[PDB]
Amino acid sequence: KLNDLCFTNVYADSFVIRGDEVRQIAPGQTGKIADYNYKLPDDFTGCVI
Amino acid sequence: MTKTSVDCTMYICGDSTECSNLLLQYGSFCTQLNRALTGIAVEQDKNTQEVFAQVKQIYKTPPIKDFGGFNFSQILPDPSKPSKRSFIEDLLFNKVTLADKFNGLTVLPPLLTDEMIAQYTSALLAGTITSGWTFGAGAALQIPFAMQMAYRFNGIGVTQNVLYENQKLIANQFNSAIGKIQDSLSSTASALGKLQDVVNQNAQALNTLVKQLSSNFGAISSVLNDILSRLDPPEAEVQIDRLITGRLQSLQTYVTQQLIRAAEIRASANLAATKMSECVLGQSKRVDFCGKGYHLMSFPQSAPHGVVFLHVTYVPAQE
Amino acid sequence: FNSAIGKIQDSLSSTASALGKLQDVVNQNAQALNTLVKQLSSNFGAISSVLNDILSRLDPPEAEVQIDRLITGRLQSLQTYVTQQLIRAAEIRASANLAATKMSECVLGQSKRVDFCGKGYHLMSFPQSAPHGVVFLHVTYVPAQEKNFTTAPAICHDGKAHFPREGVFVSNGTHWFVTQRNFYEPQIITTDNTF
Amino acid sequence: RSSVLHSTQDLFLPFFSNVTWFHAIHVTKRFDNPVLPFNDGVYFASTEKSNIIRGWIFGTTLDSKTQSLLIVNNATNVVIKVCEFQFCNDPFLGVYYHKNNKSWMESEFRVYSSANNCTFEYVSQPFLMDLEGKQGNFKNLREFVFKNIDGYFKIYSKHTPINLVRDLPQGFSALEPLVDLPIGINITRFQTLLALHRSYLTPGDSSSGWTAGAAAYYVGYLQPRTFLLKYNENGTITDAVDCALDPLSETKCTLKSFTVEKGIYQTSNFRVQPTESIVRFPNITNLC
Amino acid sequence: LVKNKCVNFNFNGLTGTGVLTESNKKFLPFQQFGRDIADTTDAVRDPQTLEILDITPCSFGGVSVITPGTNTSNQVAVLYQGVNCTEVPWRVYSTGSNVFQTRAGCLIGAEHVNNSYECDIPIGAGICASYQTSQSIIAYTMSLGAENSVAYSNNSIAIPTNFTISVTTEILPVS
Ligand SMILES: *[C@@H]1O[C@H](CO)[C@@H](O[C@@H]2O[C@H](CO)[C@@H](O)[C@H](O)[C@H]2NC(C)=O)[C@H](O)[C@H]1NC(C)=O
Ligand SMILES: *[C@H]1O[C@H](CO)[C@@H](O[C@@H]2O[C@H](CO)[C@@H](O)[C@H](O)[C@H]2NC(C)=O)[C@H](O)[C@H]1NC(C)=O
Ligand SMILES: *[C@@H]1O[C@H](CO)[C@@H](O)[C@H](O)[C@H]1NC(C)=O
Ligand SMILES: *[C@@H]1O[C@H](CO)[C@@H](O)[C@H](O)[C@H]1NC(C)=O
Ligand SMILES: *[C@@H]1O[C@H](CO)[C@@H](O)[C@H](O)[C@H]1NC(C)=O
Ligand SMILES: *[C@@H]1O[C@H](CO)[C@@H](O)[C@H](O)[C@H]1NC(C)=O
Ligand SMILES: *[C@@H]1O[C@H](CO)[C@@H](O)[C@H](O)[C@H]1NC(C)=O
Ligand SMILES: *[C@@H]1O[C@H](CO)[C@@H](O)[C@H](O)[C@H]1NC(C)=O
Ligand SMILES: *[C@@H]1O[C@H](CO)[C@@H](O)[C@H](O)[C@H]1NC(C)=O
C-alpha cells in the first residue's frame, strides 16, 4: 500500500554489515552494532532492504 | 436538555466497512447505547410535557386589559411582537441568546417547538388571572382579579378587607415590583446562574467528547481511515481492535454521564412541575415552597430548557 | 361514586394502558436483563463465545490470554448491568417515596395541595396493590356547572361597608345575596354573615 | 428453538421476488428446457402430476473437463454423482408405452458419454414414485433450494399437496434440509431433465418421435437477506417476516415482535454514497 | 475537480468524504489545511489548482417509521431525521407519494393537512402523525387544544350550581 499515500521528507540510509546482524538492525531490539553504530527509534516507520 | 442521539455504529467504526465488522463481534453494546440515549431524549421532551401541559385547553388572554389596578404588560404576550413571547419572555430569549449533523452527532429537535411552549405559558398566565385556581381543578371560572386577590389574603390569614381598603397602594407596589424584576434580569450579568450551568455542563461533555475522538488511546493513529489505509486486516486487528475498545469507553462514560444528568433534570422537572402545579394553579400553604415568605400566587415563564417562576409574596414591613 | 367506580372497572378490563406507566418499568427491566444474558453469546474479540470451549481447546498460556479477554468483555457487560440497574433502582426508589407518600398522604388525611393527588380537590384516596407497583384511585370534587352573576366587593349600608365572612357577594341583579364560592347557596345578607 | 423469534442473515428468496415461469408442454409443438443462469439463489419449484420433470444438471461449462454434478430421480433414490460427464446437447429421460406389457421403460439413457474419474459418489435415502401415464391437473408440488456455501453443496425440500392453483400458493411452508454434500465444484449454470412420453402414434425416432405433453417449472434466485423467523412451540417455522423488503417490515426486526403497536420507532441509519473518487496528488512529473 | 457532489477525496495521503465547494474564508499563502473547532478538517487547498474548497460530510440521519399500529393497518410513513427532503429518491417507497418537508426532517408517506388535531403519534417540532383524517397517515401541526376565552369583567362572576365526583387512577412503580 506504499503506492497510495504521500509522505513527508523521505530519508535513505546505506552502509555495509555482516550477514548475521541484518536481523539485529530492527527497531527496539538491542545489539552491539545497533548500540554503537546505528540505533533505530522504537517506533520506526519504513522498510529495511 | 438538548436531545442528543449518537449512533453507535457511525461514531466508533466510522465510514469504513471493515471497521464495522469488529463492532458486530462486540454485540449489542452498540445497540444498547443508542437505546439509552433515546430514552434520555424522550425524557427531555416528556419532562417538558409534564411541566407545561398542565392545561387541557389554551385560554386566550382577555382583550380588555383591566387588571383591577394591576399592570401585567411585562408578563403577558404581545400580539404586535412576532413569536408571541412576553416582554419578560421575549427578552429572555434575548438574554439567553446573549449568554449563548456536524459529525457522528445528531442533535434532535424537541417535540414541543419553542413557539408552542410560549402558548402553554400564556395559557397558565391567562388562566390564573381570569379564573384564579378554578381552572386547575376543572372548568375555569371567571372571577374579578381584585376579588381573587381577596381570597389569597384570606388563605395567608390577612383579612380580605385589608386588600380592598388599600388596593391602590397594593397595586402600585406590585407594579413597581414587576418593573424592578424586569430591570434586574437585564442588568445582572449572571442572575440565571443555575440555568446557565446546565447548558454549559452539557456543552463541555460534548466538546470533551468531540475532543475525545482525536485522542490516540494507545494506537499509532487517531483516525480510522488513516489507520486502516496504513495497515492490513491480518495484523490490522491489534490496533483496530484497541481503538475500538478505547472509543467504546468514551461512549459509555458519555452515555452513563447523560443518564445521571438526565436523572438530575428529571427531578428538577418534577420539582418544577410540582411548583407549576402546586404554585401557579393554587396558593401553597407550605412555607418557603414558593419563593420566600407568605405566598399569594406565581406566574410561570419560559426560557430555553428551563422555567422561570415569578413569586408574589406577602411580608410584614413594620412593627 | 358507584357509577364512577363502575367505569374504572370497565376501563381497567378494556385496556393495558393503565399499567403502561408501571408496565413500561416491568418491560424495560426485563429487556435489560435479556440483553445482558444474551451478551454471553458475544465473542468480545475472543476465539469462541462459550467459556468452556475456549478452555478445552487452548493450552494454559494462550488460554490465559483469551480468558482475560473474555473477562474484560464480560466484566464490562456486568458493569453496565450494575450501573444500569442502580439508575433504575434509584428511579424506582423515588417512586416508592412518592409511592410511599401516595400510599400514606392521599390515604391518611386530605391534601390541600392542588393536583398533587388526582385532578381537583381530593376528598379521599384508596390504594390497590399491583404487581411491582401501587395503584392509587383518587376521588376528587370538580364543579360541573356555572351560572353568571354580577358581583361587587363591599356593600355600604350606613356609610360603613360590610364584607362577607367566608363567601363572595353574588347578585342575580334583583337583590344581593351571599353564596359559597364553590356551590351556589344564596343567603340573605345579614350582620351574622358580615363585619 | 421453541417460541423464540430469531434473525439469521442467511441467503433467502426475497419476498415477492420476480419469478420466471417455464413451460415444457406441447399444448402446438412446444418443448423448451434450455440452460438457465445460476447464482446463489437457485430455487427450483417444479409442479408435476404424472412426474415429467425428474433430474437436474449443475456445472461451470459442462465441458467434461471441469468437475460437475448430475442426478436421476428413480423410484429407488435421487441418485447423484460428481463426475466429468460429457452431456449431449439435448439430454432427457425416455419412457415408452408398450402394447404387450403396460409399463414405462427407459429407451435411451444417453444422458452422458463417459466419466473420467469420481471424487464423490453417492446415493440418497429410499423413497417411491407413482409414474402414471395419464393426463390431469398437477395435484402435487415440489420445491427445492440448491445452494453452495463454504465448500459444501446443499439441498432443501418439501412436498406440498396444493390443489388447483396455477401460481405459487398463497401461504407459508418451510423447506426441510434433505441432504448435505461436501463438494468443491464451482457451477455457473444449471439445467433440468424432462421425461419424453414416447408412444405408438409418434414417428418413431430420437429427433421427432415424442409427445411430451404438460410440464411446468419456476426458477427464483437467492440473495443475502435477513429473515426474522418465528419459531413455534414444536419448532416448525410457522411464520417469517423479511426485514430487508419493507419499511414496515424493518420496524418489526428492530422491535423483535410480529405485532407492532402504534408509535414511532427508529430502525436504521441512512447514509449517502460518494458519486466519484477524486485523487489530486502533486502535479509534478519528475520522478524520484 | 468535482464540486457539489459527495465524492471520496484523497489529498496527499489524507482521505475524507464530503461535498467540496469553494470556501469564502481567505487563507494565508503558507496555510494548507483548515480545521474546525471540533478538530475535523473543514477546508483544503487544491494542491494542483491552489484553490480553497470547504469540506462538509455527506448528510446522514436516523430513520423512523410512523405506524398507526400493526393491528389497525399496514400503512407506514417514514421520516428521515434531519436529512433534506430533496435528498436521494424499499425502492418503491423512496419517491414520496406525499413528500412533505417538515422542520424535524423529511417525511415521506404522509399528507400534510391544514387542520390541527390533538397529538397522536408525536414526531418533532410541532408535527404529529395520525391514522385518521380512504385511510392515510396524515401529519398535522398539533395546535394545543380548543381556544376559548373565559368571559371577563370587573362586575361579572361565575359560581357552580352542580358538582361531579370522579375517580382518577395514578400508577407508580414500587419495586
Ligand atoms: C346535578 O347533576 C346530577 C348528575 O348529572 C343530576 O342528576 C341527574 O339528574 C337527571 C335529571 O333529573 C336524572 O335523570 C339523572 O338520573 C340524574 N343522575 C345523573 C347522574 O344524571 C342532577 O339533576 C343535577 N342537578 C342538581 C342536583 O341540582
Ligand atoms: C481425469 O482425466 C483427465 C484427462 O486425462 C485429467 O485431466 C488432466 O489432468 C492432468 C493432471 O492434473 C493435467 O496436467 C492435464 O492437463 C489434464 N488434461 C489431460 C487431458 O490430461 C484429470 O486430472 C483426471 N481426473 C479427474 C478430473 O479427476
Ligand atoms: C402598563 O404599563 C405599560 C408600560 O408603559 C403602559 O404602556 C400601559 O399603559 C400600562 N397599562 C395599564 C396600567 O393597564
Ligand atoms: C335571583 O334571580 C333569580 C333569577 O331571576 C330568581 O329565580 C330568584 O328568585 C332571584 N332572587 C329572588 C329573591 O327572587
Ligand atoms: C418483474 O418483471 C416484470 C416484467 O413484465 C415487470 O413488469 C415487473 O416490474 C418486475 N417486478 C420486479 C419486482 O422485478
Ligand atoms: C467458476 O467458473 C467461472 C466460469 O465463468 C469462472 O469465471 C470462475 O473463475 C470460477 N471460479 C472458481 C472459484 O472456480
Ligand atoms: C405440534 O404439537 C402439538 C401438541 O399438542 C400437536 O397437536 C401437533 O400435531 C404438532 N404439530 C406439528 C406440526 O408437529
Ligand atoms: C434543501 O435543499 C434545497 C436545495 O435547493 C434548498 O432550497 C432548501 O433550502 C434545503 N433545505 C434544507 C433544510 O436543507
Ligand atoms: C357567561 O358569560 C357569557 C358572556 O357571553 C354569557 O353569555 C353566558 O351566560 C356565560 N357563558 C360563558 C362564560 O361562556
Swiss-Prot record, chain D:
Annotated region described as Putative superantigen, given as residue ranges: 232-253
Ranges for domain BetaCoV S1-NTD come to 1-255
Result of changing D205N? In strain: Lambda/C.37
Give the region (Disordered) as residue ranges.
24-32, 94-116, 125-137, 198-214, 271-287
Q: Which residues of this chain are annotated as glycosylation sites?
A: N18, N74, N101, N117, N186, N234, T275, S277, N283
User: Changing D90Y: reported impact?
Assistant: In strain: Gamma/P.1
Give me the disulphide-bonded residues: C83-C118, C243-C253
- Recorded consequence of changing W104R: In strain: Omicron/BA.2.75
Organism's domain of life? Viruses
Instruction: Indicate the impact reported for R142S.
Output: In strain: Gamma/P.1
The identity of this protein, by name, is: Spike protein S1
This protein's species is: Severe acute respiratory syndrome coronavirus 2 (2019-nCoV)
